[PDB]
């Protein structure tokens, strides 16, 4: 432990900002003595041998709240000469030696990404995201954060880069695959609302490659359909939904999930006279499904969950509502 | 060795630690944690655990909300008691005595023991308020928490009236009611200290039936043993002994 000699540099670096704040009338001298003592205690806690990511986050939160307090006080005392750049630089320094000391803590990596995104640092955010993905490649949350922020920026090629490396790594759970199909169809909806893409064959290709993965269950394909069924206002949405249903019917013929997609298929983009027409079609499918030879307890639990989802909406007729209740109660 | 006697009195009257081993030992003295863990604990960890304890205590009883502002404050994480003046130390002593009178009823509970552990590990109540802390733990003298408080108490910081506890500090066993009652019949100071503690609580209406039954039993047995001591057969000595018994009793019974 050379921690005193190690923290001497960070205190001597933070000193001239305190000299500027003392030569302005923004912080008084007793308050600056308090800032000196608090930063000194924080540095000698941070550079200690036995340290913790919560200790690094407490120091980050204190420095960031000091920047916010000085911003409020500077706007109140009407000064424009004092800048926040030194505080952002030292907060980046705290975070860089934080991710040096504890690279295996995703809470601290995500706090670093939240800070770098919040003070408008996109290129630095991309570099931090690359380092975090290299250290935690099995983390679907980090991969979806990278891909969704690249899609939110609009660099769809970079979003596909992050997502295809993520689906190359995370193949135990379906989560990142579902989020990639969600992002690709959101790109398809953006390409539609801007008015290949005319076919929209990429989620069908995602399904065809996902057919051979170690998570490939009927529940996983039902999760694929439950992702796909949102935002039906598209062009090839019926093509995608019909391909999912014929894949599940050709592969898992008598599963309750396949009977559930047989129930809930024809209600794609409905909200309105086309609503109860397709509801009567789906209820015919549902009654045939309930009488048919399938695990009725599993199919009934699926249908009462979907019927709670149905009952969550207003603006319907009471006869339809009470016949949903009557068909619910005997399950 | 008159110089060694003067320096021994100076070292016993001193309060703040002045070398690193003394600071580590005085920080190691705790109620809950073992010493090997309690050395390496900053005042944010202790404040988090003991503020969870005080949140439970403040949800149990309503009247802990001023101590939420003055004793268990996030600023009271940082205050060193040995760096404030005599009037700040006296007002802090008044606040601590009020909290101990308030917390004496719930002291078998782990929230209240966590709150007392915060007072002990931050404000050093076992060194600076040994009288009120030892008196508020005296009605619970049959419990392991009293055994631990007896373990962490400094020896020369105990008042003279509670110096019967020294064999129970040398061998960590809880003292019996026979020992407390016998020292109450022998010393008037211990009986006056117990009665003064419970009357100072009962004037602030922070009584509880454990404390009331404790004081009633020990003053009953102490007046019993005191009469059996005061009886002499000689007329003038029994007159003077009845007068001394009434002068030692009269304020307590005239208020209670």
């Amino acid at each position: 432990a050379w921690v005193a000699d190690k923290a001497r540099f960070y205190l001597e670096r933070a000193a001239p900002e305190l000299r500027e704040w003392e030569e302005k009338e923004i912080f008084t001298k007793d308050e600056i003595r308090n800032l000196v003592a608090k930063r000194s205690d924080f540095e000698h806690l941070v550079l200690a041998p036995g340290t913790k990511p919560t200790d690094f986050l407490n120091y980050v939160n204190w420095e960031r709240s000091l920047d916010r307090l000085r911003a409020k006080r500077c706007a109140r005392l009407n000064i424009r000469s004092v800048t926040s750049h030194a505080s952002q630089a030292r907060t980046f320094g705290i975070f860089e030696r934080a991710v040096l000391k504890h690279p295996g803590s995703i809470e601290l990596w995500l706090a670093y990404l939240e800070f770098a995104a919040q003070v408008k640092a996109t290129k630095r955010w991309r570099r931090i995201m690359t380092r975090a993905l290299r250290l935690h490649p099995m983390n679907a949350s980090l991969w979806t954060l990278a891909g969704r922020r690249a899609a939110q920026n609009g660099d769809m090629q970079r979003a596909r880069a992050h997502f295809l490396r993520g689906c190359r790594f995370c193949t135990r759970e379906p989560t990142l695959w579902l989020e990639y199909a969600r992002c690709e169809m959101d790109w398809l909806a953006r390409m539609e609302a801007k008015k290949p893409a005319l076919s929209g064959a990429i989620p069908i290709a995602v399904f065809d490659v996902a057919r051979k993965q170690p998570f490939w269950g009927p529940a996983a394909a039902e999760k694929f359909f439950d992702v796909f069924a949102k935002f039906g206002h598209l062009s090839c949405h019926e093509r995608i939904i019909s391909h999912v249903v014929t894949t599940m019917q050709e592969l898992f013929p008598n599963h309750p999930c396949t009977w559930s997609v047989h129930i809930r298929q024809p209600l794609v983009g409905v909200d309105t006279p086309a609503f109860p027409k397709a509801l009567r079609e789906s209820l015919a499918r549902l009654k045939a499904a309930l009488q048919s030879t399938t695990d009725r307890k599993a199919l009934a639990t699926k249908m009462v969950a979907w019927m709670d989802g149905i009952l969550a909406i207003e603006k319907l007729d009471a006869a339809i509502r009470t016949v949903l209740e009557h068909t619910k109660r005997s399950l | 060795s008159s110089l060694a006697q003067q320096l021994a009195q100076i070292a016993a009257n001193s309060r703040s630690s002045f070398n690193v081993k003394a600071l580590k030992a005085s920080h190691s003295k705790s109620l809950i944690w073992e010493p090997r863990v309690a050395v390496s604990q900053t005042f944010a960890e202790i404040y988090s655990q003991c503020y969870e304890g005080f949140k439970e205590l403040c949800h149990l009883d309503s009247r802990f909300v001023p101590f939420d502002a003055t004793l268990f404050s996030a600023q009271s994480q940082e205050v060193d008691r040995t760096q404030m003046t005599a009037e700040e130390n006296a007002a802090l002593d008044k606040r601590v005595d009020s909290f101990l009178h308030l917390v004496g009823s719930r002291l078998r509970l782990m929230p209240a023991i966590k709150a007392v552990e915060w007072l002990i590990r931050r404000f050093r109540i076992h060194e600076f308020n040994t009288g009120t802390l030892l008196a508020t733990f005296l009605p619970y003298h049959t419990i392991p928490a009293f055994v631990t408080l007896l373990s962490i108490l400094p020896v020369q910081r105990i008042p003279i009236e509670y110096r019967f506890l020294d064999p129970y500090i040398k061998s960590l066993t809880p003292p019996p009611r026979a020992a407390i009652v016998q020292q109450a019949t022998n010393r008037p100071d211990l009986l006056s200290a117990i009665s003064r503690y419970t009357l100072d609580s009962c004037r602030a209406k922070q009584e509880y039936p454990g404390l009331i039954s404790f004081w009633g039993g020990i003053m009953a047995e102490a007046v019993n043993g005191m009469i059996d001591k005061m009886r002499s057969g000689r007329r003038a000595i029994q007159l003077e002994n009845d007068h001394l018994l009434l002068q030692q009793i009269g304020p307590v019974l005239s208020e209670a």
Binding site: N34, S65, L69, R73 | T70, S73, Q75, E78, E88, R95
Partner: peptide, 27 residues
């Protein structure tokens, strides 16, 4: 007052609250 409540909360968190601790003592 000329100070926001969020500014006073940041002042009590960042800078310390020693003066109001002494004020809460002497009551």
């Amino acid at each position: 007052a000329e100070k926001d409540a969020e500014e006073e909360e940041l002042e009590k968190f960042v800078l310390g609250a020693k003066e109001t601790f002494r004020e809460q003592l002497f009551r």
